[PDB]
Amino acid sequence: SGAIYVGNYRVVNRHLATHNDWANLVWEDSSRDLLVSSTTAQGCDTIARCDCQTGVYYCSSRRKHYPVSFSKPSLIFVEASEYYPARYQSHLMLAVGHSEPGDCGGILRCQHGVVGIVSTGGNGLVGFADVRDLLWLDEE
Numbered sequence: 001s002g003a004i005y006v007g008n009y010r011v012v013n014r015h016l017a018t019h020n021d022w023a024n025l026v027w028e029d030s031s032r033d034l035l036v037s038s039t040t041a042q043g044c045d046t047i048a049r050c051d052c053q054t055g056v057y058y059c060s061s062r063r064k065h066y067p068v069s070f071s072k073p074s075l076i077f078v079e080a081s082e083y084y085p086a087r088y089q090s091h092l093m094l095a096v097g098h099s100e101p102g103d104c105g106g107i108l109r110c111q112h113g114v115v116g117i118v119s120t121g122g123n124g125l126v127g128f129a130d131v132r133d134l135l136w137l138d139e140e
């Protein structure tokens with residue numbers, strides 16, 4: 001579990017969105033595993049606007065933040081889960097690291113701010129849904 005709180009927005013993995021998130025929907029994209037809902041309180045996270053390929057992510061299954069090198073946002077095949085059939089997920093970045101299902105929502109960050117959130121994992125790999133191209137998160 002986990003979310004990004006920037007301005008009056010809450011950014012969560014679409015497969016973990018609550019009824020309240022769907023009832024206060026701003027934007028959602030199944031192909032990216034993202035959903036954004038509106039909030040009453042202002043958040044403190046800042047979104048990175050950069051092309052960093054190194055950062056640090058939070059792993060709930062180890063209570064630890066790990067430094068990692070990660071690939072550029074791309075279209076990657078993800079195996080069938082209980083939330084999605086086997087499909088191509090877009091705007092996904094891969095890194096070597098520990099990840100279990102419940103690790104989704106963990107923040108990945110660089111020197112400029114929040115880069116994305118854990119979305120996939122498995123066999124010594126961890127996937128992140130990129131948010132740096134969503135410029136509208138910084139306004140309205």
Ligand SMILES: COc1cccc(NC(=O)N2CCC[C@H](C(N)=O)C2)c1Cl
Nearest residue numbers: 033078081084099100101119120121122
């Ligand atoms: C023990 O680690 C494993 C082993 C096998 C599969 C997975 N689960 C995923 O990667 N997810 C599930 C949620 C939905 C994601 C998605 N964005 O499609 C995929 C993990 Cl983390």
Ligand SMILES: [Zn+2]
Nearest residue numbers: 050052110112
């Ligand atoms: Zn950066």
